[PDB]
């Protein structure tokens, strides 16, 4: 996080805010809701409170304006700058302006008022742009269908006003770092020559032949998917990639969730209704066998037969000597299975049912 130069800060802890005019793009109700919830994100992690007023001046004056609109920060029509807010302070201080030749929404369509307002109000309280890609204050517009403060945002805002008067203290997701040797993965899959690691709302993509890591929201590519993947694998045969969460599984082609999916695992792969979820999955280069891992047991399914194999609720620790009895993630590369469990990574050889290397979970990255 980065605190606005000069460290402007509101002196009162009980602030007032007013919505001057309303955008035509939405019903007043929807605008009101967006703003309210935007303020709440901030009041949840600090002692500050925001009260909506109707008449008269307020600390934070909110408005929808078009082009040059009386303040020296002219808007640029459709596109470009969506909004801007001023530092805490008297007058125009703390005010937020949304550019009206923007198409404010309440859905996944660009640009969602709640999301942009949550960000603007940040500047309204004294925060500047963060260099943390996962932070709400980051300079951009991403939409993971659920606006929330990243741990970085909380630290930034608490540094100016103190922490929540909550006895528990809210927390926010932390952005994974590739050079942290404490890194662990929710799931991993290969895709058109690259390896794609998943962790919370993020993903880390790499081509092992030229180590250079790409970090970003899973929603940048597949907005439909629910954040919190548990397993995943590629099936280049159909050029798809399947993700598992809960007990249903989404399939994807290119950058769009295929028709109908999600779908049930039981009806799609044939798995006893006993299995709640899944821990990890991989598919053999060109053998047609796909291995799914649950708990300490594993199962095999034949793609070219839309069906499992004769009695397969077998043991992990037994047929995969060395990796232990629980898989966090796994993917295949050049004939070897790469198993992940916590920060541990075992390079397993299918042929010799042998373990060649035992590395750190993030060993692939350049650190
Ligand atoms: Ca604009
Ligand atoms: Ca003001
Ligand atoms: Ca508009
Ligand atoms: Ca997992
Ligand atoms: Zn303005
Ligand atoms: Zn900003």
Residue numbers in the entry: 81 to 447
What did the paper state?
Matrix metalloproteinase 1 (MMP-1) plays a pivotal role in degradation of interstitial collagen types I, II, and III. Under normal physiological conditions, MMP activity can be regulated at various stages: during transcription, proteolytic processing of their inactive pro forms, zymogens, as well as by inhibition of enzyme activity by endogenous inhibitors such as tissue inhibitors of metalloproteinases or TIMPs. These enzymes have a similar domain structure: an N-terminal signal sequence to target for secretion, a pro-peptide domain to maintain latency, a catalytic domain containing the catalytic zinc, a linker region, and a C-terminal four-bladed propeller structure called the hemopexin domain. The collagenases cleave the triple-helical collagen approximately three-quarters away from the N terminus of the substrate, resulting in three-quarters and one quarter length fragments that are unstable at body temperature and undergo denaturation, rendering them susceptible to other non-specific tissue proteinases. The proteolytic activity of the enzyme resides in the catalytic domain but it requires the hemopexin domain in order to cleave the three chains of the triple-helical collagen.
The active site zinc is bound in the sequence HELGHXXGXXH by the three His residues: His199, His203, His209 and a water molecule at the active site cleft. The present structure on the other hand stands unique in being elucidated in the absence of an inhibitor. This is the first unliganded structure of the full-length MMP-1 where a water molecule is seen at the active site providing the fourth ligand for the catalytic zinc in the tetrahedral coordination sphere. The catalytic domain of MMP-1 also contains three calcium-binding sites. In essence, the hemopexin-like domain undergoes a major displacement towards the catalytic domain, thus widening the cleft between the proteinase domain and the hemopexin-like domain on the active site face of the enzyme.
